[PDB]
Amino acid sequence: NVKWEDVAGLEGAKEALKEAVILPVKFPHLFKGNRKPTSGILLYGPPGTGKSYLAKAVATEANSTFFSVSSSDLVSKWSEKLVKQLFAMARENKPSIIFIDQVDALTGSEASRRIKTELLVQMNGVGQGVLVLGATNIPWQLDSAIRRRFERRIYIPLPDLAARTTMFEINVGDTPSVLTKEDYRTLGAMTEGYSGSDIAVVVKDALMQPIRKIQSATHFKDVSTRKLTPSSPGDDGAIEMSWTDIEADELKEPDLTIKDFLKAIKSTRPTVNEDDLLKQEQFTRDFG
């Protein structure tokens, strides 16, 4: 789970969410009298950008309750009362943010119309401690009515160089790493186009690499600091043995090298193509 102080500048979006969510949600006293805040916020942009974790981080920072639901889950399963339930929960726990993922899914038939109704109903009934945060990867297929209920709209872009580096560091985490921060910048530089999600897929592949090299192995060498590391037929001091019979305390718990990530980066290719980003920038012109 992402932390707010970790969240990147987002080509403006971090500061926008500060002005739009945190300020009014955390400091309502500040909007006393003949001034008032907006209502309804649509986060939009390329997929894989982790908007709901971004939503979560802004909630945690605004010191508000957080309820997230998925439209595609709501529409492609069983449910009008569940929408009713969620807003009731939110009212009991003011201030609270309701995040609704994939607001696309409420436009497509049948049950989709029935949920769009109730959501729209609930929001009209909302608008003074219940902020609604919708998210969509496909704002072009977003219905005017739904759209019109999201006054503020914020574009969440793909990660840039600094962001991607950080993502590589965070995803790795506590894991035994012998990687330079210079080597991390390589990984960031290396992954232009990748979404934070794309990147997670990569790291999970990379972290399984030391391990996979242990089970692939058939020979081991005592790199005595016994501590056995994988090898091949006859390098320097190899023993033709089974990893399944190495003692837990006799296993050279291997370190992460850059090349672990390289194979994985060369595998997984970017989700979001150049075509899709163009259709996003049109939305920002006419609706942003």
Residue 279 marked ligand-binding: no
Under 8 Å between Cβ of 184 and 169 = yes
Residue 159 marked ligand-binding: no
**At how many Å resolution was this determined?**
2.9
CA dihedral 67, 165, 17, 21 (to 10 degrees): 30
Which amino acid, 66?
Answer: F
Residue 49 marked ligand-binding: yes
Under 8 Å between Cβ of 4 and 58 = yes
Residue 84 marked ligand-binding: no
Strand 219-222 and strand 228-231: pairing?
A: antiparallel
Q: What is the DSSP string of 226-237?
A: --EEEE-TTSSS
Overall size of the chain counted in residues: 288
The structural domains of the chain, ordered by start, are 1-158+271-288 (3.40.50.300), 159-270 (1.10.8.60)
Q: What is the DSSP string of 29-89?
A: GGG-SS------EEEE-STTS-HHHHHHHHHHHHT-EEEEEEHHHHHS---HHHHHHHHHH
3-class SS letters over 76-102: CCCCHHHHHHHHHHHHHCCCEEEEEEC
Strand 238-240 and strand 219-222: pairing?
A: antiparallel
Nearest CA-CA partner of 177 in 196, 199, 202, 203 = 203
Give, in degrees to the nearest 5, the angle at Cα 164 between 161 and 168.
Answer: 140
Residue 65 marked ligand-binding: no
E strand or H helix at 24? helix 23-26
Q: What is the DSSP string of 6-20?
A: GS--GGGHHHHHIII
Under 8 Å between Cβ of 199 and 168 = yes
Under 8 Å between Cβ of 231 and 217 = yes
Under 8 Å between Cβ of 53 and 87 = no
3-class DSSP state of 194: coil
Q: How was this structure determined?
A: X-ray
Integer Cα distance of 212 and 180 in angstroms: 23
Integer Cα distance of 71 and 86 in angstroms: 13
Residue 125 marked ligand-binding: no
